[PDB]
Each structure stands twice: as C-alpha cells, then as structure tokens.
Write a protein that binds this ligand. Structure first.
Ligand SMILES: Cc1cnc(Cn2ccc3c(Cl)nc(N)nc32)c(C)c1Cl
Length: 208
C-alpha cells in the first residue's frame, strides 16, 4: 500500500537548506501555502468555464485554516484542482528543478528565503515550521492520495482510506515543538492580515 520514493537531488538540497539555515522570519510559510491554494482554486475555476462538470465534485471554492493544539497540527484545506498520483511522484519534482537551482543561486547572491515563492517552490517552506508534512489530495481524474515526508531525502505516497474529500488538497503541518505559536488564533489572524489579505477566495480561520 505505502510506496517510498527519493526526492530529486536538488529538492533534497533545498529542503536541507530550509531546515538548516538560520532564518527567523518563519511566518512566511503560511502565505506560501495560501498562495498555492489560491492558484489551485483559480485552476479548477477556469477549467470549469469550458467543462462545468468539473465542479460535480464540489462547487464551493474556499480555503480553511484549522489549528489543533492536541495533535500539534495546523491544516490548510482548499477545494482547488487537487493533485494526481503523477503530480505527486514525478511532475512536481521535475518542474521544480529549474526553480530550485535558480532560488539557491539567488540566495548565494543576496536574496532572502522569503522570496522562495518567486521560484515556484514555496510549498517546501512548510519545513521552516513542520517536522513532518502530510498532504491529502483528490483530483477529478484520479483517486484520493496521502503524500508524506519528514525530509528523509524521502517521501511516501499511498491511496488514502480516510475521510473522502470530494476535490482539493489538505496540507497537514505537524509542527516542531518550538513552533506552537502558529496554533494561536491571534497569531494566525495577524499573519493572514499581513500577507494574504487580498486572496480572492474566502479564508476561514477555525478556532478551538
Ligand atoms: C511535493 C509537493 C510539491 N508542491 C506542492 C504544492 N502544490 C502543487 C500543486 C498543488 C495544488 Cl493542486 N494544490 C495545493 N494546495 N498545493 C499544490 C505540494 C502540495 C506537494 Cl505534496
């Protein structure tokens, strides 16, 4: 059921840089994940203009932010296009190679980790705050999958038997012990207002 894969060498190098570099401005991970959700919602919305049946798996286009203090997780949920098995295992890693190389060269010349999204690899900024990331996803053309990685240089993919999603992506951040501020209502609200106030989809910050 669970298959294990090696990241492309450039992606393992990027993840190590994100985990090892001293960089205090960790809060930017949330803007990067919300921007990915917004891009995924724009993609399904635009495809639905030529094929309305693409919304048979759910008409609502939104982003939810769900903290869970008991589990020490922050989850970013969207009803965007979702990812196929081929996206998870091959396509996302392949497309990211040029952007990863460009980003690592830009950092050597004076750029900052907060610019990661300009290189299309902002998802990996999740490792600024998470020791493990679990991604549940469902694309209209494929089955529901669970992707997972604690940065071994490896990740896993399995068909998911959990709560059916309809369509979209859930990024579950298993936070590092010293990063629990990202479970606080006031802190998430502050970050969303600072970096994500103009996103074109409703962002609901759940509370406990
Ligand atoms: C390996 C990897 C790379 N990039 C990403 C970021 N991404 C790529 C496609 C995609 C969609 Cl359709 N929705 C969301 N919200 N995020 C997405 C992930 C989620 C993984 Cl798992």
């Amino acid at each position: 059921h669970m298959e294990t894969f090696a990241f492309q060498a450039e992606i393992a190098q990027l993840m190590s840089l994100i985990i090892n570099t001293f960089y205090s401005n960790k809060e930017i991970f949330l803007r990067e994940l919300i921007s990915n959700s917004s891009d995924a919602l724009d993609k399904i919305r635009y495809e639905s203009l030529t094929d309305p049946s693409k919304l048979d798996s759910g008409k609502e286009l939104h982003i939810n932010l769900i903290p869970n203090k008991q589990d020490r997780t922050l989850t970013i949920v969207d009803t965007g296009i979702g990812m196929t098995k081929a996206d998870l295992i091959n396509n996302l890693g392949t497309i990211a190679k040029s952007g990863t190389k460009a980003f690592m060269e830009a950092l050597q010349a004076g750029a900052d980790i907060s610019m990661i999204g300009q290189f299309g690899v902002g998802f990996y900024s999740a490792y600024l705050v998470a020791e493990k990331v679990t991604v549940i996803t469902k694309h209209n053309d494929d089955e529901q999958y669970a992707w997972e990685s604690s940065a071994g240089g490896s990740f896993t993919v399995r068909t998911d038997t959990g709560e059916p999603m309809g369509r979209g992506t859930k990024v579950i951040l298993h936070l590092k012990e010293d990063q629990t501020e990202y479970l606080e209502e006031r802190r998430i609200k502050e970050i969303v207002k600072k970096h994500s106030q103009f996103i074109g989809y409703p962002i609901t910050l759940f509370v406990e």
